[PDB]
Amino acid sequence: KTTEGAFYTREYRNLFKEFGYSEAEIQERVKDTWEQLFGDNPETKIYYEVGDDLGYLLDTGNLDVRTEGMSYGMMMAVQMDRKDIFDRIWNWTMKNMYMTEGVHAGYFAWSCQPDGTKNSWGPAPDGEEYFALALFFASHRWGDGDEQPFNYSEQARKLLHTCVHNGEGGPGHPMWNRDNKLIKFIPEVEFSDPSYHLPHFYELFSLWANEEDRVFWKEAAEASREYLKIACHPETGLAPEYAYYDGTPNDEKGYGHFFSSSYRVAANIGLDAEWFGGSEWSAEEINKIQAFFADKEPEDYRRYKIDGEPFEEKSLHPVGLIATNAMGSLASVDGPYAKANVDLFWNTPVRTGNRRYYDNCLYLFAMLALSGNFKIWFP
């Protein structure tokens, strides 16, 4: 590590403020972003309330409710101290997504219709890891409820138990390969997705998961840091959406390039550097991604091969790309392009249109992280 992280100091960098933005404008912008996503602002909103006790995040582009969006929404709500929103989302999640039958019992069906109908009985591991951490944060901020499923920390430990141990007495599959400690793209495959690797989350799991797994989680954190070094292109810093355990792109179905999924790598690296400390690798990695985009206009952002070669196809989520590249500045605060990225993001409005969901989730995490408001909530 090259700096001491917020995990040790309990002070979160307000990068917007350090780059010269006023405290009043920053506060306004964070709240405005929240309100545009969770309030009534129908052109821009992604959260929808249902009755007195339910609510969900809608993938506006695919017309479904995704565990990615639900777990994001729970993380957002706990960072904003909004138990009411947190509990609505988590309650919908448990009611409509949690599976008690099939090979993936104990996990969450990745895509549901707005009426709660499962589109699939397959889970998406990046959902599970966000559910668990947001649950731990909920336990810590508010206390475990007495009524299930609001017993937050028990639900978190129980979920992470399944993630590691599923398949031991039965037909299930774990979400992490036990030998290499790497998160999988889905439980029944043996390849991964770089954007799913959250070593900073695993550090916390190594403190708060069932004791029998705390060594595993510290090992998974280290394995995830090593994997990112091999998965990011050495010149451009670009990661593929899917990658084999060997770090190379899995393009069997067109996911071997730098597109929507990959964007989150830079954000993940920034947040890890802020929580657990800078490193040389992270700063250089962010410098590479930012250097790569420095001569490119947002209107012209493309799909790229990880070597930098452009496709005709434009970025489907260019706002999310901007936001993640800016959030990445937390791992290279003195980097040559760090201030330009944060400024570009500052000058980019939240997204409107039917594709806004993904951009806007990335945008709110970036607002939170760059203002010193994406925090670890301790017991």
Ligand code: NI
């Ligand atoms: Ni103002």
